[PDB]
Amino acid sequence: TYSPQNPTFNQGPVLVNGYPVPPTVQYQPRYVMTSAYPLELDAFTPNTF
Amino acid sequence: DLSTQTNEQIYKFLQQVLYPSLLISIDVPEEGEYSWLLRMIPAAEKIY
Amino acid sequence: RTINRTLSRRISRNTGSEQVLNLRRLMEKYLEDTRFKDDFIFVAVDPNQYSVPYPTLVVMSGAKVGDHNHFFGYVLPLVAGLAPLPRREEQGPHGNILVPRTWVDNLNGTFINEVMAAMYAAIGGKSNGTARIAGLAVVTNEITAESAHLATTLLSAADNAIQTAIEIRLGDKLGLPQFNLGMMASDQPISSVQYNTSGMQDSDIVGNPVRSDITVTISNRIRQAMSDYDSQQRLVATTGYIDLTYSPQNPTFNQGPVLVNGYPVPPTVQYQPRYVMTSAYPLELDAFTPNTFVLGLIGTIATLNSGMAWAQSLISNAARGIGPHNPGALAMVLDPEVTAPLDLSTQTNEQIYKFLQQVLYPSLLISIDVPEEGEYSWLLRMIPAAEKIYTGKVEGEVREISEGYKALYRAFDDVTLGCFSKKYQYGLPLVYATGNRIPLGHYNHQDGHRHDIRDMDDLYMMNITNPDTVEAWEDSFDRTDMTMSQRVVARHEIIDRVLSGSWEQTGWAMRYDFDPLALQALIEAAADAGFTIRPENIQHAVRGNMAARARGLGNISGNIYARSDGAFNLF
Amino acid sequence: RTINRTLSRRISRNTGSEQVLNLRRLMEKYLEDTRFKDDFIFVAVDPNQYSVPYPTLVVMSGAKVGDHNHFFGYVLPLVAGLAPLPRREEQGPHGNILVPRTWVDNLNGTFINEVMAAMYAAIGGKSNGTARIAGLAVVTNEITAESAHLATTLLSAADNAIQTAIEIRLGDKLGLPQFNLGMMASDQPISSVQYNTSGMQDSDIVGNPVRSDITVTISNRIRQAMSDYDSQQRLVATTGYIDLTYSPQNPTFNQGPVLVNGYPVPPTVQYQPRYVMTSAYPLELDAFTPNTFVLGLIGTIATLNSGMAWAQSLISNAARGIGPHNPGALAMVLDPEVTAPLDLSTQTNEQIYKFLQQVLYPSLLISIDVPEEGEYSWLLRMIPAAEKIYTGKVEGEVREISEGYKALYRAFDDVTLGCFSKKYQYGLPLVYATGNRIPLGHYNHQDGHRHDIRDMDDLYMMNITNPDTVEAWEDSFDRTDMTMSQRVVARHEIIDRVLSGSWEQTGWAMRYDFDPLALQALIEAAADAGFTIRPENIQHAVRGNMAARARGLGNISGNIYARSDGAFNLF
């Protein structure tokens, strides 16, 4: 996901886990879940999810 | 082409352009085998 | 364990199968028409009533001497459709490590005790006879109602194992002979070799691939006396491949030069060729016993040394060009500056031979892989048993000698009609242990076939990966301050990284090698018993006079020439 | 052993000496004129009648409480003129190794039992009192009839040790006070530091050199009220040097940046400075106890952090140019291509400081070397005793705490009049063990003096040897999968190769380091008790306005601004 950091707005640096990042970083990784299913369980309920 | 680089070199290359965190998302189908189960996620979006 | 009973559903997608019922039905159906209906007993052992990890079937048969009955069984665990074993945490010098396991790791003493109890319940009791286990093999492929061929093959293997056990244990009392070289006295043995490395490989009884770079066939030649017809009868076959072992020579230790066959070698030579045997099986012989295995070993050794015929494997591999089995990767060893493997597909055979002579020792090491379970593991377990020569038992005068050593020595002596005893001293080594545990399995090749996992060797690492991986692989094969589990972990990690985790493991094997002096004595003893062999496929005028060099007079005796013509003692 | 008696000769070149007779005579001669003639007892133990390895002398003195007598002894083995110990073969993971030994390795429990028996025979019997050992020191230099000064110094050391033991054991019943910071309430403490690295070094009681790169002196300032005279009174001194520890930062593990004092550091920083204390001794104080040691520690910590005063040692060393202590060797660490240490003798101080800021962490680690025997080993053994916080003894509710930890905590709390207890939690760590055994000894320097063997450190290896040796040295200092004997062997081998075998070893030492949180709490508690110090020797206008930056208004609250203005639900 495209997500540039704006330093020119007189804001503080971007901190991830309390640590600053290099000025060239501009993309945010994202994990997308596509499916979930049982293997040896007979029943699949919201708690199993 | 990065097929001739070692793993640490590729990791260092990636550290210059990507944020070191992950966003968790999910695709909810409008109909399917488990749509009845997964429709609970959209239902919780409106708190009040 | 009982989650399904608690949270239950009416219709289930997983129901399981009945492999033991399917296999037993096929075997009985095959036997119902022959005359051996009553010679076999089938015993079903399942975890619901015995403490066993997998469903198994036992094939039993008996023999009677005097008034006593003796029973022998062949065990077949069926594991298709089960989850693979997890990793086990062990204790190391630094900390904890996780070690891979496979199916055979669960077959301990408890399993043997349970199988024996089931067998005794089958025959009637302890008073009805005696029972012993004759073999074991794991079946990893599914058994359906359309698997008649596999059932017939498994039944044949069980029958051969049981019959051989009966012979070895009670031949003298039952008058059963065994193979020896005297039965080949009135005919002419021959041999042949095939080098093939592209395409499908050999397969085992279950159906899994086996590495077969080199194949040797031993036959018998026949001619009709009056009608002049020609024919041959094929006896036994053997498969294997060629590997490399790092072994630098140290001149700086003020030692003498390394001599091979009494000849010095160039200073740049640092790798030792090694031959690894992967399988051996009969062709038209009905029975396969340890003596037949000795015959196969003799034939293979004679063929592979016929004019350096083993180097033809590397020369043939060099013709494909750049690839995982290219011998041109040794150019990087020879010259450090060279960083890319060399292409030798446009060189003549003698040029390639000359190139190889600068980096390899001119001798061969004979080794063998012994599986922990399989079709012929019962036969091949005799090699590990002979590794320990002496039981440390107290001796009145001369130390006691173990039983496995005795069995192997007796086989060698009986095949050659008693000449081995006169050639080799009783008590000298026959077999050495390397200490390496090798995995067995398969993976998907880019040509559409399944290939043996043993394709990953030193040459593969030289051609495919970087030098750090090569160093790590060789180190796990050679270092003496590493335990077995540590070596297993190192090799497993490298294979998993190279293949991206897309492979399947089926078993384990251990590697042993023979003593060269014992092998030379065996060849000489076989010759002294009247046995000769004629290889038929070995390939490779020259100007000059060769006899003139040997007739030169160098030096003469020196007696033919006329001979020419205070402080210390002070006190 | 009795070869000389068998093959004997009338005149012998080796006759030996009587060190115990010489030393005892000198001590008694010194005491014969004072008023303490009857306060001391001298006991001679020799191998001819007791099971001891060396000739030893014991100095004893007593104290009486009630009707009971208590006796304390100081032990002095004399080893000049004997052959050095041989190497001992040990067991390793791979095989056998030969480990060096020195004089102290022979002083085991049997030696202690024999010394105690001799002491009991001296005083009359078990019914005449009780005996305890108060200290131990090995004398490696010869004693002749012209060694009065050495005898007097040894007697003084023994007296101080015995008196301190009596105080610690029986002060409450005997009414004996101990030092604390309340006695410095009406005066002004001061401190001074000297950086010297060329020439002679400091010496111990026997006369062997001690590494003294940094020396700190703690004094007291006095002014006469009416006459206005000025004077100072010197109390205690401390010596030590600066070392380096390899400690790379790993950014690739997806962790946060390394923060020192809440500030990030440049990516090229990879070495951690370390301060090692080598000795501490009194100057004009007659008594030296654990409380006095605490005062010395407080003074040293306060002085070394006064405006980065410790980096002045490296800056001063950089002025000599190319040599074994040149900090310019770190240029090879910074840039790989650079292969020769840099010369920094023509740079200004700020330039050198800027160069150092690119490779070093801006903090200091406090460590100490504890000798296994020596003049003050009885005092300094309390540091190792506090390393184990908890005895694993079963607890009704709260786990039991050990006695050594209690003693160290009590000393810290008593010196500061009970403020340390309010600042630091009871049961938190105070001391860590590194696990490294360090040799003690000396060698011949090219300037004509004997130098401490502790001159061989990381910087020496960087400047003198090749990078492989540097890697081996650091690895023996840091790897956790190496036993103690293996590290000792590795370091011994490197030193022997560098010095060509021309050196002498005298003893052993172990290295410990303090907890930084405990040290900060100790400094704060000392301040809260009314104690202040004024360093007098610390060195290091600037344009600009520094207060203007702090008065800038950055941001304001956002509340001051006016605010603007089917499938899922199907069933």
From Swiss-Prot, chains C, D:
Taxonomic superkingdom: Viruses
UniProt keyword Electron transport, yes or no: no
Localization of this protein: Host cytoplasm
Gene Ontology cellular-component annotations: host cell cytoplasm
UniProt KW Membrane keyword: no
UniProt keyword annotations, A-Z: Host cytoplasm
Physiological role: Self-assembles to form a proteinaceous shell that encloses the viral DNA and compartmentalizes proteins and DNA during viral infection. This micrometer-scale compartment contains narrow pores and is the site of viral replication, with the proteins involved in DNA replication localized inside. Provides a surface for docking of capsids during packaging. Probably protects the viral genome against host defenses.
Record's subunit section: Homotetramer. The tetrameric protomers further assemble as a square grid.
Protein name stated in the entry: Chimallin
Organism annotation: Escherichia phage vB_EcoM_Goslar
